[PDB]
């Protein structure tokens, strides 16, 4: 059984941490939604 | 029970204690997750029930109460940030430039940022603050690290 519980309001953050890096990838989205990397 | 706008974890009771199970949004009374996070069942805010409206699995998205109401979109260009909500973790922002999932049907937004797996449903938002995708969906690249597809619904 399920529940939700409220986790806050959505907003941007000025100055928030900023990281991740920005890749370029080939992809497949097969039907039960699962992404794979084409090669 | 609550209806206000914002973004609440997804938990269960069924396993040891309380455990998350993912995250969503809350917005024009519409609740907004991945359907890998609650495999499309019902949910509970307080004494209030909400029920499935709309949902597929290709997609990889659910609505509850009503139908998908985010239809912001990636600029292509601008940092984003993602609004994880981790287990047992305060809500935290993390600002990033996404990358780019290629595919045989177009391009899509990606965030290069690894979380826990009850992170599932966290919203991703440009500088205005709307939810332009929810993290979750993606795949596990040469180096082992983790990217998100930045995953976006219909607005009918
Ligand atoms: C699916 S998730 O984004 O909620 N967390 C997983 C990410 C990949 N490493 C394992 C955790």
Same mark, same amino acid.
């Given at each position: $059984? ?5 986790? %806050? ?5 000025? $100055? ?13 989205? $097969?039907?039960? %939604? $699962? ?5 | 029970?609550? +209806? ?6 997804? *938990? ?20 907004? +997750? *991945? @359907?890998?996070? +609650? ?6 805010? /307080? ?16 609505? #509850?109460? /009503? ?6 979109? @990636? ?10 909500? =981790? =287990? ?5 922002? !993390?600002?990033?430039? =996404?990358?780019?999932?290629? +595919? ?19 919203? !991703? ?6 939810? !332009? ?12 690290? #983790?990217?998100?597809? !930045? ?6």
């Amino acid at each position: $059984d399920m529940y939700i519980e409220r986790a %806050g309001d959505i907003t941007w953050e000025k $100055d928030a941490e900023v990281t991740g890096n920005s890749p370029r990838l080939d992809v497949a989205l $097969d039907e039960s %939604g $699962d992404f794979s990397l084409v090669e | 029970g609550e +209806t206000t706008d914002g973004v609440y974890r997804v *938990m269960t009771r069924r396993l040891l204690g309380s455990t998350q199970v993912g995250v969503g949004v809350m917005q024009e009374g519409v609740f907004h +997750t *991945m @359907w890998h996070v +609650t495999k499309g069942a019902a949910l509970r805010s /307080g004494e209030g029930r909400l029920d499935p409206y709309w949902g597929d699995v290709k997609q990889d998205l659910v609505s #509850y109460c /009503g139908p998908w109401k985010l239809d912001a979109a @990636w600029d292509g260009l601008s940092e984003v940030q993602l609004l994880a909500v =981790p =287990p047992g973790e305060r809500a935290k922002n !993390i600002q990033t430039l =996404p990358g780019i999932f290629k +595919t045989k049907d177009g391009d899509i937004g990606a965030v290069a940022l690894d979380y826990p797996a009850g992170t599932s449903g966290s919203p !991703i938002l440009d500088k205005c603050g709307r939810v !332009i995708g929810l993290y979750g969906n993606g795949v596990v690249i040469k180096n082992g690290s #983790y990217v998100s597809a !930045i995953t976006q619904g219909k607005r009918e």
